[PDB]
PDB file of N, CA and C in Angstrom:
ATOM      1  N   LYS A   1      -8.388  -9.594  34.228  1.00 48.03           N
ATOM      2  CA  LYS A   1      -8.198 -10.004  32.842  1.00 48.03           C
ATOM      3  C   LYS A   1      -7.830  -8.810  31.967  1.00 48.03           C
ATOM      4  N   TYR A   2      -7.163  -7.829  32.563  1.00 45.11           N
ATOM      5  CA  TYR A   2      -6.754  -6.632  31.838  1.00 45.11           C
ATOM      6  C   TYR A   2      -5.528  -6.911  30.973  1.00 45.11           C
ATOM      7  N   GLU A   3      -4.818  -7.988  31.294  1.00 44.98           N
ATOM      8  CA  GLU A   3      -3.624  -8.367  30.547  1.00 44.98           C
ATOM      9  C   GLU A   3      -3.995  -9.125  29.277  1.00 44.98           C
ATOM     10  N   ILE A   4      -5.034  -9.949  29.369  1.00 43.58           N
ATOM     11  CA  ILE A   4      -5.490 -10.732  28.228  1.00 43.58           C
ATOM     12  C   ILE A   4      -6.361  -9.893  27.299  1.00 43.58           C
ATOM     13  N   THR A   5      -7.029  -8.894  27.865  1.00 40.64           N
ATOM     14  CA  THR A   5      -7.898  -8.017  27.089  1.00 40.64           C
ATOM     15  C   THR A   5      -7.085  -6.998  26.298  1.00 40.64           C
ATOM     16  N   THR A   6      -5.932  -6.618  26.841  1.00 38.45           N
ATOM     17  CA  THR A   6      -5.061  -5.649  26.187  1.00 38.45           C
ATOM     18  C   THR A   6      -4.215  -6.312  25.107  1.00 38.45           C
ATOM     19  N   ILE A   7      -3.813  -7.555  25.356  1.00 40.19           N
ATOM     20  CA  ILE A   7      -3.000  -8.300  24.403  1.00 40.19           C
ATOM     21  C   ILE A   7      -3.835  -8.765  23.214  1.00 40.19           C
ATOM     22  N   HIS A   8      -5.111  -9.039  23.465  1.00 42.90           N
ATOM     23  CA  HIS A   8      -6.017  -9.491  22.416  1.00 42.90           C
ATOM     24  C   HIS A   8      -6.522  -8.312  21.589  1.00 42.90           C
ATOM     25  N   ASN A   9      -6.503  -7.125  22.186  1.00 46.56           N
ATOM     26  CA  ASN A   9      -6.960  -5.919  21.506  1.00 46.56           C
ATOM     27  C   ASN A   9      -5.885  -5.383  20.566  1.00 46.56           C
ATOM     28  N   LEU A  10      -4.627  -5.564  20.953  1.00 48.52           N
ATOM     29  CA  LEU A  10      -3.504  -5.100  20.145  1.00 48.52           C
ATOM     30  C   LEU A  10      -3.515  -5.757  18.768  1.00 48.52           C
ATOM     31  N   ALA A  11      -4.092  -6.952  18.694  1.00 47.00           N
ATOM     32  CA  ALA A  11      -4.172  -7.684  17.436  1.00 47.00           C
ATOM     33  C   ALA A  11      -5.602  -7.710  16.906  1.00 47.00           C
ATOM     34  N   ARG A  12      -6.282  -6.572  16.995  1.00 45.64           N
ATOM     35  CA  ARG A  12      -7.658  -6.465  16.527  1.00 45.64           C
ATOM     36  C   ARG A  12      -7.710  -5.884  15.116  1.00 45.64           C
ATOM     37  N   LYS A  13      -6.714  -5.070  14.781  1.00 47.57           N
ATOM     38  CA  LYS A  13      -6.643  -4.449  13.464  1.00 47.57           C
ATOM     39  C   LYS A  13      -6.533  -5.506  12.369  1.00 47.57           C
ATOM     40  N   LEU A  14      -5.868  -6.612  12.687  1.00 45.40           N
ATOM     41  CA  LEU A  14      -5.692  -7.699  11.730  1.00 45.40           C
ATOM     42  C   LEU A  14      -7.025  -8.376  11.425  1.00 45.40           C
ATOM     43  N   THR A  15      -7.962  -8.278  12.362  1.00 47.04           N
ATOM     44  CA  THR A  15      -9.279  -8.879  12.193  1.00 47.04           C
ATOM     45  C   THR A  15     -10.162  -8.023  11.293  1.00 47.04           C
ATOM     46  N   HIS A  16      -9.913  -6.717  11.296  1.00 47.47           N
ATOM     47  CA  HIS A  16     -10.687  -5.790  10.478  1.00 47.47           C
ATOM     48  C   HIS A  16     -10.189  -5.793   9.036  1.00 47.47           C
ATOM     49  N   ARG A  17      -8.894  -6.036   8.863  1.00 50.44           N
ATOM     50  CA  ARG A  17      -8.293  -6.066   7.535  1.00 50.44           C
ATOM     51  C   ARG A  17      -8.723  -7.313   6.770  1.00 50.44           C
ATOM     52  N   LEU A  18      -8.785  -8.439   7.472  1.00 51.56           N
ATOM     53  CA  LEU A  18      -9.183  -9.703   6.859  1.00 51.56           C
ATOM     54  C   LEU A  18     -10.700  -9.790   6.728  1.00 51.56           C
ATOM     55  N   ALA A  19     -11.407  -9.079   7.600  1.00 50.26           N
ATOM     56  CA  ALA A  19     -12.864  -9.073   7.579  1.00 50.26           C
ATOM     57  C   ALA A  19     -13.391  -8.541   6.251  1.00 50.26           C
ATOM     58  N   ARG A  20     -12.585  -7.723   5.583  1.00 53.59           N
ATOM     59  CA  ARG A  20     -12.971  -7.146   4.302  1.00 53.59           C
ATOM     60  C   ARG A  20     -12.979  -8.209   3.207  1.00 53.59           C
ATOM     61  N   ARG A  21     -11.995  -9.101   3.250  1.00 54.99           N
ATOM     62  CA  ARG A  21     -11.887 -10.168   2.260  1.00 54.99           C
ATOM     63  C   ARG A  21     -12.914 -11.264   2.528  1.00 54.99           C
ATOM     64  N   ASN A  22     -14.184 -10.948   2.295  1.00 54.86           N
ATOM     65  CA  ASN A  22     -15.262 -11.905   2.512  1.00 54.86           C
ATOM     66  C   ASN A  22     -16.018 -12.176   1.214  1.00 54.86           C
ATOM     67  N   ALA A  23     -16.423 -11.107   0.538  1.00 55.73           N
ATOM     68  CA  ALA A  23     -17.152 -11.228  -0.718  1.00 55.73           C
ATOM     69  C   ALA A  23     -16.412 -12.132  -1.698  1.00 55.73           C
ATOM     70  N   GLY A  24     -15.086 -12.153  -1.592  1.00 54.92           N
ATOM     71  CA  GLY A  24     -14.285 -12.978  -2.476  1.00 54.92           C
ATOM     72  C   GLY A  24     -13.652 -14.153  -1.757  1.00 54.92           C
ATOM     73  N   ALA A  25     -14.228 -14.529  -0.620  1.00 54.21           N
ATOM     74  CA  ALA A  25     -13.715 -15.646   0.164  1.00 54.21           C
ATOM     75  C   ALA A  25     -14.698 -16.811   0.168  1.00 54.21           C
ATOM     76  N   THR A  26     -15.358 -17.028  -0.966  1.00 55.02           N
ATOM     77  CA  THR A  26     -16.326 -18.109  -1.092  1.00 55.02           C
ATOM     78  C   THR A  26     -15.863 -19.147  -2.109  1.00 55.02           C
ATOM     79  N   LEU A  27     -15.115 -18.694  -3.109  1.00 58.21           N
ATOM     80  CA  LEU A  27     -14.608 -19.584  -4.147  1.00 58.21           C
ATOM     81  C   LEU A  27     -13.887 -20.780  -3.536  1.00 58.21           C
ATOM     82  N   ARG A  28     -12.676 -20.545  -3.038  1.00 60.50           N
ATOM     83  CA  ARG A  28     -11.883 -21.602  -2.424  1.00 60.50           C
ATOM     84  C   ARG A  28     -12.665 -22.291  -1.309  1.00 60.50           C
TER      85      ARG A  28
END
């Protein structure tokens, strides 16, 4: 599963960027 682990890791930065938008992600 080194192919799925590497492909899923390449798109991990997007999870950290959106993870920040939480305190203001309650309104909507």
